[PDB]
DNA sequence: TTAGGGTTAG
């Protein structure tokens, strides 16, 4: 539930599935040891970067332009 | 409005002594009910009655605009719908009175 | 005390 910054997160290309059919994909890793600065630090939810990330999601949901979800429209009942 | 001031006095001696009797009850005008009053919580249920009673799904989704939508779009097209009643049109023309707090 | 900045092979 908290916010993190993954310093020196590794990216790596993937191209296969478990049954070895082709599929292009992206991997992510963090190697042991702190050399070069590999690490994580919990971010406080008072940090302006977290405000920027919040700001971003404000568009990613209202102006999402994404297809339907919660087809079970009888589910919410708002403040039930 | 319906009976403005300035009328001739209702002289008693005339009203009685007349042979050609004319009086407040000699000839009269008929009247269909002007401006009745409601109790608020009956006005409210008059409204809330006519709403549900008139709500009509087809009549908000006319074809051929219909018959093309996805279900979700169709439902959200229909999930809100006002209505404006103007009581002063009813017969009788319901005046509205209360205290404001 | 340790560590005392610099790429894993996952």
From Swiss-Prot, chain A:
Changing residue 35 to N: In TPDS3; significantly increased telomere length and numbers of fragile telomeres. Changing residue 24 to S: In PFBMFT8; uncertain significance; affects function in telomere maintenance in patient cells and when expressed in heterologous cells; decreased DNA binding; decreased localization to nucleus; no effect on interaction with ADC; no effect on localization to telomeres. Residues 35-38 are annotated as: DNA-binding. Ubiquitous. It comes from the Eukaryota. Component of the telomerase ribonucleoprotein (RNP) complex that is essential for the replication of chromosome termini. Is a component of the double-stranded telomeric DNA-binding TRF1 complex which is involved in the regulation of telomere length by cis-inhibition of telomerase. Also acts as a single-stranded telomeric DNA-binding protein and thus may act as a downstream effector of the TRF1 complex and may transduce information about telomere maintenance and/or length to the telomere terminus. It is linked to Tumor predisposition syndrome 3: An autosomal dominant disorder characterized by an increased risk for the development of various types of benign and malignant neoplasms throughout life, with age-dependent penetrance. Affected individuals can develop neoplasms involving epithelial, mesenchymal, and neuronal tissues, as well as lymphoid and myeloid cancers. The disorder is associated with elongated telomeres. Cerebroretinal microangiopathy with calcifications and cysts 3: An autosomal recessive disorder characterized by intrauterine growth retardation, retinal exudates, global developmental delay, neurologic regression, intracranial calcifications, and leukoencephalopathy. This is Protection of telomeres protein 1. It comes from Homo sapiens (Human). The gene is POT1. The chain holds residues 236 to 315 of 634 of the full protein.
Swiss-Prot record, chain B:
It is found in: Nucleus; Chromosome, Telomere. Component of the CST complex proposed to act as a specialized replication factor promoting DNA replication under conditions of replication stress or natural replication barriers such as the telomere duplex. The CST complex binds single-stranded DNA with high affinity in a sequence-independent manner, while isolated subunits bind DNA with low affinity by themselves. Initially the CST complex has been proposed to protect telomeres from DNA degradation. However, the CST complex has been shown to be involved in several aspects of telomere replication. It is linked to Cerebroretinal microangiopathy with calcifications and cysts 1: An autosomal recessive pleiomorphic disorder characterized primarily by intracranial calcifications, leukodystrophy, and brain cysts, resulting in spasticity, ataxia, dystonia, seizures, and cognitive decline. Patients also have retinal telangiectasia and exudates (Coats disease) as well as extraneurologic manifestations, including osteopenia with poor bone healing and a high risk of gastrointestinal bleeding and portal hypertension caused by vasculature ectasias in the stomach, small intestine, and liver. Belongs to the CTC1 family. Component of the CST complex, composed of TEN1/C17orf106, CTC1/C17orf68 and STN1; in the complex interacts directly with STN1. Interacts with ACD and POT1. This is CST complex subunit CTC1. It comes from Homo sapiens. The chain holds residues 513 to 613 of 1217 of the full protein.
């Amino acid at each position: 539930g908290s916010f993190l910054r993954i310093y020196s997160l590794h990216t790596k290309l993937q191209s296969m599935n478990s049954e070895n059919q082709t599929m292009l994909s992206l991997e992510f890793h963090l190697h042991g040891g702190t050399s070069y600065g590999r690490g994580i630090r919990v971010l406080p939810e008072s940090n302006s970067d977290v405000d920027q990330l919040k700001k971003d999601l404000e568009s990613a949901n209202l102006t999402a332009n994404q297809h339907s979800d919660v087809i079970c429209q009888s589910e919410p009942d708002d403040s039930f | 409005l319906l009976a403005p001031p300035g009328s001739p006095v209702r002289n008693a001696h005339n009203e009685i002594l007349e042979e050609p009797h004319h009086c407040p009850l000699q000839k009269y005008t008929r009247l269909q009910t002007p401006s009745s009053f409601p109790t608020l919580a009956t006005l409210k249920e008059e409204g809330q009655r006519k709403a549900w009673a008139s709500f009509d799904p087809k009549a908000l989704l006319p074809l051929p605009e219909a018959s093309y939508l996805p279900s979700c779009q169709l439902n959200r097209r229909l999930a809100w719908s006002w209505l404006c009643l103007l009581p002063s049109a009813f017969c009788p023309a319901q005046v509205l009175l209360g205290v404001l707090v």
